[PDB]
Design a protein around this ligand. Structure first.
Ligand SMILES: CO[C@@H]1O[C@H](CO)[C@@H](O)[C@H](O[C@@H]2O[C@H](CO)[C@H](O)[C@H](OS(=O)(=O)O)[C@H]2O)[C@H]1NC(C)=O
Lengths: 133, 133
């Protein structure tokens, strides 16, 4: 599928920066973060037009292989056929997803993991560089 | 095991840039490139103080879990307690490895892979940035 990375050992307060390019005719791309594939503290899925959603960011969690309750945001700062950088961090309370443009999204830390060791991109999103700063 | 990456889909003539921090007391580190843990087109192992070797870059291949013929490099452009970057590309003849001070050596591609989809880092070398030019 798309890029998968393990043993990131990302601790709270630390910054995970991902730069990638969006497909010209993109429907949906996702960035998954957590312990492994079945334990996602952050399912970041901007939907241009997929699953009945149009220009909407759908965030969710997964614990023990089971999806949590979807959270949906108002603004949709992503554009098809472009480069998008995302900076990700987390506390004991929230996952924080920042964009350079000034957009900042938050998602509740439902899994309360000690660290982020997993990252995947199952969508129309070709990762070009990943920084662990 | 350290940072492991899958589904890289690196085609011939495309660059893989890895920037990281060499530990102050670094003994050795490893960069594994190929299809999986059993199939490596490049085993890149700079040995500062490991296996009786000192300041020697050890290169090898792994095919079907079987190590190929080991090749060592004369020069050693790595200093412990510093930041080093490695740029790796290939064709179906050679792996090209570029080192932090302009040094450049080739390693035979003895697996003839259609693409590199697996990277595994280990040892005294914390990754900071992985790019895919
Ligand atoms: C009731 O079915 C579900 O409806 C919601 C509301 O539109 C859909 O969001 C949901 O689609 C799936 O959402 C999850 C995240 O909650 C994933 O993004 C999944 O994509 S993927 O991981 O397979 O790529 C969406 O298909 C939909 N279906 C399910 C299975 O919950």
């Amino acid at each position: 599928c798309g890029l998968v990375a393990s043993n990131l050992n990302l601790k709270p307060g630390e910054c995970l920066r991902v730069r990638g390019e969006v497909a010209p005719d993109a429907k949906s791309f996702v960035l998954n973060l957590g312990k492994d594939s079945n334990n996602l503290c952050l399912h970041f899925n901007p939907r241009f037009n997929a699953h009945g959603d149009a220009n909407t960011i759908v965030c969710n969690s997964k614990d023990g292989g089971a999806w949590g309750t979807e959270q949906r945001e108002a603004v949709f700062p992503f554009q098809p056929g472009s480069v998008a950088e995302v900076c990700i961090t987390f506390d004991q309370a929230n996952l924080t997803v920042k964009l350079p443009d000034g957009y900042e999204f938050k998602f509740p830390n439902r899994l309360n993991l000690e660290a982020i060791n997993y990252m995947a991109a199952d969508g129309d999103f070709k990762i070009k560089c990943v920084a662990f700063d």
